[PDB]
């Protein structure tokens, strides 16, 4: 009977439930409404979510993330060759051509397929919902990017089955975000919807059309390597150079642990800058026992990221061109992904659409799970959201 909606994200995952026409996004054990898509293996335990992300800098080799970049892919694919430079964990090709993620767990070498790693994240989201409901959950709707091919969709479904979920349906992330805002119901005539999704690792722009409760993905574009982690890297690179000028040319980038600790504080300051004009980046005993401290204004962060922020409009122009439509024909602009909280990004999109206010009432990192939860309730026979 009970069906949940799960956004299985590249960096963060989110679970929601739609009951009595309303959607609850469920907080995990730490009170977090989203959970890192991380799995770590130690000498004693298997950690998932917050606990896995929290010890990533201390156990880089055995902390797995980005399994969504590998799911349903052949190891020989050029995207795997390119992405693997970003991973401290080992990935090798099996005899069937499938990627095998290699870690040490309890002093033993273990290998996992990407869908096994994703099944552990899905199982954690299932348990987050179960703790909240006080009852077992079997049914789920899971979302995937619109560009996911048959192999990536099937492997995501398999990850659900391994997690103990009966996958009612795999639906597109941009469509789930549009469903969250009731744009399928409120719009009787044709509606052109632009989904602007900027997360932690990827940027997806999708142009949808909705005529008579039916959504069609007309055009998609974006950048699979543009997200919040790239804005954090702009702050990291600046701090590395700032440390050099302060401490006689000493180079923090030569120590990978120093970089990881600096990156963690850079991402925190970045979040603060979405609601304050300034933030402090502080790392005690960063490199060579030297303490590091710097103040970053929102203007300086905007300057370091200026080109990356402005270039988010290029895939917007591309989808409009592919769909053969003018920006004036877009009825709604939906902001999805945690990076859409950046004020400069919101301003750039608004100005591009000639002052049109984007739909951002739903927490942008929750809108996909929210829509998946609505769809899961509908597929279970509950018409209360409609």
Ligand X SMILES: Nc1ncnc2c1ncn2[C@@H]1O[C@H](COP(=O)(O)OP(N)(=O)O)[C@@H](O)[C@H]1O
CB-CB contact of 109 with 138 (8 Å): no
302 tagged catalytic:
no
Listed ranges 125-133, 185-193, 195-203, 349-357: which one lies at the site for ligand X (CB under 6 A):
195-203
CB 265 within 8 A of CB 282: yes
200 binds, among ligand X, Cl ion, none (CB under 5 to 8 A by kind): ligand X
Distances (CA, A) of 107 to 41, 53, 87, 211: 10, 20, 21, 57
Nearer Cβ to Cl ion (85/135): 135
Q: What is the closest distance, in whole angstroms, from the C-beta atom of residue 222 to ligand X in the complex?
A: 12
Q: Which of 4, 15, 16, 34 binds ligand X (CB under 6 A)?
A: 34
Radius of gyration of the chain (CA): 21
Helices (H), 28-167: 50-54, 78-83, 114-133, 150-162
* 119 sits near ligand X (criterion: CB under 6 A): no
Between the CA atoms of 62, 68, 74 and 76, what dihedral angle is there, to the nearest 10 degrees? -70
Pattern 3-42, binding to Cl ion, x per CB under 5 A?
Answer: x---------------------------------------
* Residue 182 CB, nearest approach to Cl ion (Å): 17
Active-site entry in 53, 66, 68, 229? 68
Residue 7 appears among annotated catalytic residues: yes
**By CB under 6 A, which span of 83-91, 221-229, 307-315, 327-335 interacts with ligand X?**
221-229
Q: How many residues bind to Cl ion according to rule CB under 5 A? A: 3
Asked if 191 is part of the footprint of ligand X (rule: CB under 6 A), the reply reads no
Kindly list the distances between the CA atom of residue 153 and the CA atoms of 169, 175, 247, in Å, as whole numbers in the listed order: 10, 15, 50
Q: Which ranges constitute the DSSP H helices of the chain?
A: 50-54, 78-83, 114-133, 150-162, 173-180, 183-186, 228-246, 256-272, 298-310, 313-322, 343-352, 367-379
Question: Given the rule CB under 5 A, which of 171-179, 302-310, 324-332, 370-378 is the region that contacts Cl ion?
Answer: 370-378
Known catalytic membership, residue 366: no
Per CB under 6 A, 337 contacts ligand X:
yes
Asked if 145 interacts with ligand X (CB under 6 A), we say: no
Beta-carbon-side half-sphere exposure of residue 275 (alpha carbons within 13 Å) = 4
By C-beta, is 32 or 247 nearer to ligand X?
A: 32
Q: Judged by CB under 5 A, which of 48, 141, 377, 378 binds Cl ion? A: 377
Residues from 255 through 314 that contact ligand X (CB under 6 A): 267, 270-271, 274
Non-local (6+) Cβ contacts of 48 within 8 A are: 35, 38, 39, 40, 120, 121, 123, 124
Burial status of residue 348 (CB atoms within 10 A of its CB: 0-12, 13-18, 19 or more): middle
In the complex with Cl ion, the residue whose CB is nearer, 22 or 299, is 22
Annotated binding site for Mg(2+): which residue ranges? Answer: 7, 12
Catalytic residues: 7, 68, 173, 197
Note the residues at the interface with Cl ion (CB under 5 A): 3, 377, 380
């Amino acid at each position: 009977e009970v069906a949940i909606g799960i956004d299985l994200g590249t960096t963060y995952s989110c679970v929601g439930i739609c009951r009595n026409g309303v959607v609850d996004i469920i907080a995990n054990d730490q009170g977090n409404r989203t959970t890192p898509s991380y799995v770590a293996f130690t000498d004693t335990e298997r950690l998932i979510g917050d606990a896995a992300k929290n010890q990533a800098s201390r156990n880089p080799e055995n902390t797995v993330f980005d399994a969504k970049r590998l799911i349903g892919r052949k190891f020989s694919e050029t995207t795997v060759q390119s992405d693997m430079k970003h991973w401290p964990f080992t990935v090798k090709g099996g005899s069937d051509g499938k990627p095998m993620i290699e870690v040490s767990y309890q002093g033993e070498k273990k290998t996992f397929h990407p869908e096994e790693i994703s099944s552990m994240v899905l199982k954690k989201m299932k348990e987050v919902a179960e703790t909240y409901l006080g009852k077992p959950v079997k049914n789920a709707v899971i979302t995937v990017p619109a560009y996911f091919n048959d192999s990536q969709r099937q492997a995501t479904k398999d990850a659900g089955a391994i997690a103990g979920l009966n996958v009612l349906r795999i639906i597109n992330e941009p469509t789930a975000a549009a469903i969250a805002y009731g744009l399928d119901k409120k719009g009787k005539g044709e509606q052109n919807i632009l989904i602007f999704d900027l997360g932690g690792g990827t940027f997806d722009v999708s142009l949808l059309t909705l005529e008579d409760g039916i959504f069609e993905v007309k055009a998609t574009s974006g950048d699979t390597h543009l997200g919040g982690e790239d804005f954090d890297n702009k702050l990291v690179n600046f701090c590395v150079q700032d440390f050099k000028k302060k401490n006689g040319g000493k180079d923090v980038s030569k120590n990978s642990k120093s970089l990881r600790r600096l990156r963690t504080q850079c991402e925190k300051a970045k979040r603060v800058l979405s609601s304050s004009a300034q933030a402090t980046i502080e790392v005690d005993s960063l490199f060579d026992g030297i303490d590091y401290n710097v103040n970053i204004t929102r203007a300086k962060f905007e300057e370091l990221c200026m080109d990356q922020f402005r270039n988010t409009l290029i895939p917007v122009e591309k989808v409009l061109k592919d769909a053969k439509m003018d920006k004036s024909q877009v009825h709604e602009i939906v902001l999805v992904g945690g990076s859409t909280r950046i004020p400069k990004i919101q301003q750039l999109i608004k100005d591009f659409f000639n002052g049109k206010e984007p739909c951002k009432a739903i927490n942008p990192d929750e809108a996909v799970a929210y829509g998946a939860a609505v769809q899961a309730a509908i597929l279970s026979g509950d018409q209360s959201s409609a």
